[PDB]
Amino acid sequence: PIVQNLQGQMVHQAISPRTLNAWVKVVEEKAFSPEVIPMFSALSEGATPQDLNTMLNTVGGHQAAMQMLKETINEEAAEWDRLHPVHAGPIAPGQMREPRGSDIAGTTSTLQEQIGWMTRHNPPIPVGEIYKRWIILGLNKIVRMYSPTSILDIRQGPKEPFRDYVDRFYKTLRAEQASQEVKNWMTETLLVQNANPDCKTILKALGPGATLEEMMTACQGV
Amino acid sequence: PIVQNLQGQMVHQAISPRTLNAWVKVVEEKAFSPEVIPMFSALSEGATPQDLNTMLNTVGGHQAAMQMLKETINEEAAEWDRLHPVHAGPIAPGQMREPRGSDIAGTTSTLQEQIGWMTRHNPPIPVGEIYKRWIILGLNKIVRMYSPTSILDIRQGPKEPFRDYVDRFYKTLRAEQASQEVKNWMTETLLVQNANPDCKTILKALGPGATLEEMMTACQGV
Amino acid sequence: PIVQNLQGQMVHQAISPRTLNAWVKVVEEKAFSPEVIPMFSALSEGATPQDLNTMLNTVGGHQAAMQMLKETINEEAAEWDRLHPVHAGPIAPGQMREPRGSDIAGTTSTLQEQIGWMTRHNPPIPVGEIYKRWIILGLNKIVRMYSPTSILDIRQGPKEPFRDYVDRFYKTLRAEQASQEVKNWMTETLLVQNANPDCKTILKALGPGATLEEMMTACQGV
Amino acid sequence: PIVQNLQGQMVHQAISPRTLNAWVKVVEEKAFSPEVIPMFSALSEGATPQDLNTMLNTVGGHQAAMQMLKETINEEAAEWDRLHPVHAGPIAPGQMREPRGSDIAGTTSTLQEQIGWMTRHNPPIPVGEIYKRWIILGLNKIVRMYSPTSILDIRQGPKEPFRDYVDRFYKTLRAEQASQEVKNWMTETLLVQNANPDCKTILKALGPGATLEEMMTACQGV
Amino acid sequence: PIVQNLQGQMVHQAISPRTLNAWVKVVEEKAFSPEVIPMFSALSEGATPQDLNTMLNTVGGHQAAMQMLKETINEEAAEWDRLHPVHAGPIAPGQMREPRGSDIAGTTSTLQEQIGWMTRHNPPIPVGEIYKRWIILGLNKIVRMYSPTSILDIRQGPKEPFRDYVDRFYKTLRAEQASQEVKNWMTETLLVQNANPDCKTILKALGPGATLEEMMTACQGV
Amino acid sequence: PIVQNLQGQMVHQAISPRTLNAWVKVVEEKAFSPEVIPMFSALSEGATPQDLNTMLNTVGGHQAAMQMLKETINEEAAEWDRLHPVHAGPIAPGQMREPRGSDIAGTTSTLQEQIGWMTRHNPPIPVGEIYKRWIILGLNKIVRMYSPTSILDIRQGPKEPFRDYVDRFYKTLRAEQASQEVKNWMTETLLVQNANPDCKTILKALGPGATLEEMMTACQGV
Ligand SMILES: [Cl-]
Ligand SMILES: [Cl-]
Ligand SMILES: [Cl-]
Ligand SMILES: [Cl-]
Ligand SMILES: [Cl-]
Ligand SMILES: [Cl-]
Ligand SMILES: [Cl-]
Ligand SMILES: [Cl-]
Ligand SMILES: [Cl-]
Ligand SMILES: [Cl-]
Ligand SMILES: [Cl-]
Ligand SMILES: [Cl-]
Ligand SMILES: [Cl-]
Ligand SMILES: [Cl-]
Ligand SMILES: [Cl-]
Ligand SMILES: [Cl-]
Ligand SMILES: [Cl-]
Ligand SMILES: [Cl-]
Ligand SMILES: [Cl-]
Ligand SMILES: [Cl-]
Ligand SMILES: [Cl-]
Ligand SMILES: [Cl-]
Ligand SMILES: [Cl-]
Ligand SMILES: [Cl-]
Ligand SMILES: [Cl-]
Ligand SMILES: [Cl-]
Ligand SMILES: [Cl-]
Ligand SMILES: [Cl-]
Ligand SMILES: [Cl-]
Ligand SMILES: [Cl-]
């Protein structure tokens, strides 16, 4: 990482063992669950591409998945390159070279260089955050593909305490590919459409606009 | 976090693994118990909304509950917006933009920006503390809903050492929705109203005004 | 905490997880034993009332006991207020307000304010240490009430190696309410008054003035 | 290590126990797996040859393997020496001596000297990174030799979920000696050439150009 | 502690949890073994009397032993006071008061004051080291009294590999009360006087002057 | 330790618990294995004699071995003293005294003094490194004496995979007393002289000059 300030002494510190080890254990245990992704970001705070590469390389197993991530990152790199057209020019003394897709994925650049882009002169290029975004995209893809099931098959059981049904439904929701608007839509429509008949009733008896707390409170007594 | 001083070198440090991991384990084990909330605050000291978002996202399971928290935070955001009416104006160079509900919930803002509001120029906006307050509110709601029982059903057993009854009663009390005045009221009235007849007697024999230590000492010998 | 110096850069650092977690585990395991109190102080070094409040709130269970502590702290607060009579006056710009009982118990004050009192201008008010003293007082009370037994019932068994008897006696002593003079008195008088007849003899055979090492050495061979 | 900055206070800090211990445990458990190598680099960030020597010496067992590493490093040293021909000259006061192969492997140099080369005057010699590269080369050799099998024997089983086959194939791939071009070649050709007939079919039905995600999605239903 | 320098920024840092907890566990497991004492010193590096008091108070059990330590420290305090005769005088502004026995045992002094004595003006009083010496003295006493046996009863068994006998003998030696000269004497005389006849012989066959390595090498083959 | 720089703020920090505890556990588990020695050095980076003394004293058991170390260190001290002949002179104000053998073994010197020698004025005396060298010498002696066997008795079993034989042979080699030239000699000669007949053959079939990798590759198929 590169530790921040608005007047303090900035530093380039490499990933700690605590951080590193944490990451290995999360992947080792949790496989491909949505929380893994926030954990990744959390552990990656202020990370440079080298740090990011480090975290990704140290995973053993899930080699299919770690390959899809490489494909995804490659595509992001190509897109970056189309839009950011390279110059045929000599980088003059007193200038830093413009970064290409691969330099941002950390493969074609030095720690120094990555360190420089994030610091720069006046114009700042946060390659760590950019690359981090590419990696989260691929991780999203992977989480989706490894989601055991479709949101439409979340049906509340006959003896299922409403709270537990809500727990399954939103868990499955977090792993879907859809956007905010679709999630909004699925929330109203499918939460009450898929509840058990005993409850489906009471929830209808609150009309079309009531908070989740109201609903859970409503369905508390069976 | 953002580490304090009154003359020292301030810093923007992201959540540590020790902190992060601690939080996951508290939720993992303790579910929705009142101590969780002080733990949350404790781990969140000096946190920015990104940090807060980080801690909340990394929970896996309790997805019903984590959704009620989002609803609650949304409502706090709407209230903030009604009272804080946005301007149609260009943020001029040398100014920072005013934060809206969503920027404070960290969703619509950058770490930079959050970092700036807490530092500012002369007028300080502690978005971390503000947001932290919204989150504790939703957590209160959740703790209440997950409280197994009502304070009025705390009755001292026939062979129940007074100390253990007091332990249940205040545990249940901590999880109630009521205000200070109501808690005061319930303390006097219901502690002695719900004690077992053997004790209920001795406590009456100290009149209407005696400390908890006096009472426990009083009921020490059965 | 607030880390000290006599020329260094002072800092306001919040309780660490290591510290926090340590405290939870000591209470979790040791219940209400005298060592808990030195542990508390040890973990609380340089703590502000917020830190103190944090450590206390995070205990789950022992809710009777955690309530007696609140009562005790309340009484300390009232005493502080009687002696420290508040002014009807406007705190002028360039002044910090005087703290009342509740501000010191951290309930009615900000971290900023607590930070300021300990730093001040010329006149320093160490609210952390003051409050810490109130809390240790209540903890003393609690340790006393949770002491299983009276010092007068510590009697050396017929086959009890003198060393083990001394171990029980002083353990029980640490948990008594009495002052230094009483402890001195109980040491001489009751240590030899309560020893088994075989030993009681040899100790008398050293007269009325001999060190503990002399006594243990004396009673080494049965 | 030597902790970086672009204006901060640089430092020479030796390997921490956390780091050291981590390394021993990775070797202890994982033997000679490809992830070990990224772990090594990760733990070695900013390391000097002494640090590197430290990490390598502390391995117990795998003495065959730790000897091949010495041979490899020796060869790298010889190559460095052929190209970097030493001078017969007195290192004048105000100069630092040029490093030879053995000084870079840390065997013939002081921490001071290693510290100096990485700092220098104007011309920087990163002996830590150079040596680190030699060590990773030998580790590559060792990982190859300890790879249980050839990539050409990765065949998808009759009831083998495509995902698991992809997991084996890329795992085995990571441990091969071949270059990027060969890996590219083996990816297309051998992934579909070695799949089971049920799948081999569907993948052919996507033509010769389709992403890994497309393929896995394609073969999801048996 | 108070962290050192010869030009750096000095600091007053309180005992860490890592340190604290370590100490509790050593006492908890090892009881009263000689290594405990070096551990104590090791953990106490740079400690002030408050720190020292902290470490000692946090022990639970061994209350006999923890009382002998108090007696011993009291005697050291009295000796300090006899030699350091207090003045009847007003400590003038611009002076720090002279410390008495109890201030050094930390009982009668503030952290501030302890902090000051170790810093002072020109004349430095290291109360931490002084007190630490008193505590190690009492710990020596305690280790002696808790030594299970006398050095004169260390006899090599008939089938006892010389190495194991040497291991017992020096272990027992470390726990004896005697000075260097006595230990020297006991080494020569009693090591060979107490060895088994098979060995006692070979050692005599090296004359009266041979190193321990020579002896162990000598007795290697039974 | 004393943490380095080439422009930074130097510090005298005592051994940490992490470090201390690590060392106790390595000795506790690994006994007297060659890796212990690199671990020792690793943990001792930048250590002063006090630190070194600390690490050595905290070992419990292996008292024979810890005594041989004292003998060895004594001899190193005597040698230092013969060559470094002490002056009969008054150390004038503005000078630091020259260190003798015992001051370097840390027994006759203060932390201050040790701190000073390593810093000095212009002429630097690294007593920590000097003493560290004495200790590693004694540890070498001890590792040798505790090596279960002679290198000449390492013979490859009839069904022994060449790799495992190489693992034993070099393990045993690391624990021998011999110099580099002898180790070189033993490598060629005895590795192939002691291999099983099936292999001994193939290795001869590569002539007298082939790398270890070639040999292991050669003997891969039985
Ligand atoms: Cl770790
Ligand atoms: Cl890799
Ligand atoms: Cl429910
Ligand atoms: Cl969702
Ligand atoms: Cl509910
Ligand atoms: Cl962790
Ligand atoms: Cl998320
Ligand atoms: Cl009771
Ligand atoms: Cl309450
Ligand atoms: Cl009670
Ligand atoms: Cl923790
Ligand atoms: Cl609370
Ligand atoms: Cl006894
Ligand atoms: Cl006591
Ligand atoms: Cl005894
Ligand atoms: Cl460790
Ligand atoms: Cl080595
Ligand atoms: Cl699949
Ligand atoms: Cl690969
Ligand atoms: Cl799949
Ligand atoms: Cl701890
Ligand atoms: Cl105490
Ligand atoms: Cl032996
Ligand atoms: Cl000894
Ligand atoms: Cl031996
Ligand atoms: Cl530890
Ligand atoms: Cl010792
Ligand atoms: Cl082999
Ligand atoms: Cl070797
Ligand atoms: Cl092999």
Residue numbers in the entry:
A (entry chain AAA), B (entry chain AAA), C (entry chain AAA), D (entry chain AAA), E (entry chain AAA), F (entry chain AAA): 1 to 222
Task: Reproduce the article's own wording on this structure.
HIV capsid has a pivotal role in regulating viral DNA synthesis and shielding viral DNA from cytosolic sensors. Previously reported X-ray structures of HIV-1(M) CA hexamers showed two distinct conformations with respect to a channel at the 6-fold symmetry axis. The beta hairpin structure (BHP) above the channel can assume ‘open’ (His12 forms a salt bridge with Asp51) or ‘closed positions’ (with a bridging water molecule between His12 and Asp51). Inside the channel, 6 positively charged arginines (R18) are hypothesized to mediate electrostatic nucleotide recruitment to fuel encapsidated DNA synthesis.
Given that HIV-1 CA Q50Y was defective, we returned to Chromaclade45 seeking additional lineage-specific changes that occurred along with capsid Y50Q in SIVcpzPtt. This revealed a patch of differences around CA position 120, identifying a deletion of arginine CA 120 in HIV-1(M) and its SIVcpzPtt parent. Inspection of hexamer structures from non-pandemic viruses revealed that the Arg lost from SIVcpzPtt/HIV-1(M) forms a salt bridge between helix 6 and the CypA binding loop in HIV-1(O) and HIV-2 CA helix 6 (Arg 120-Glu 98 in HIV-1(O), Arg 118-Glu 96 in HIV-2). To examine its phenotypic effect, we reversed the deletion in HIV-1(M), restoring the arginine in mutant HIV-1(M) + R120. The X-ray structure of this HIV-1(M) CA + R120 hexamer mutant at 3.29 Å revealed that adding the arginine reinstated the salt bridge. For example, alteration in capsid surface dynamics mediated by loss of the Arg-Glu salt bridge may influence TRIM5 recruitment and therefore restriction and/or activation of TRIM5 signalling.
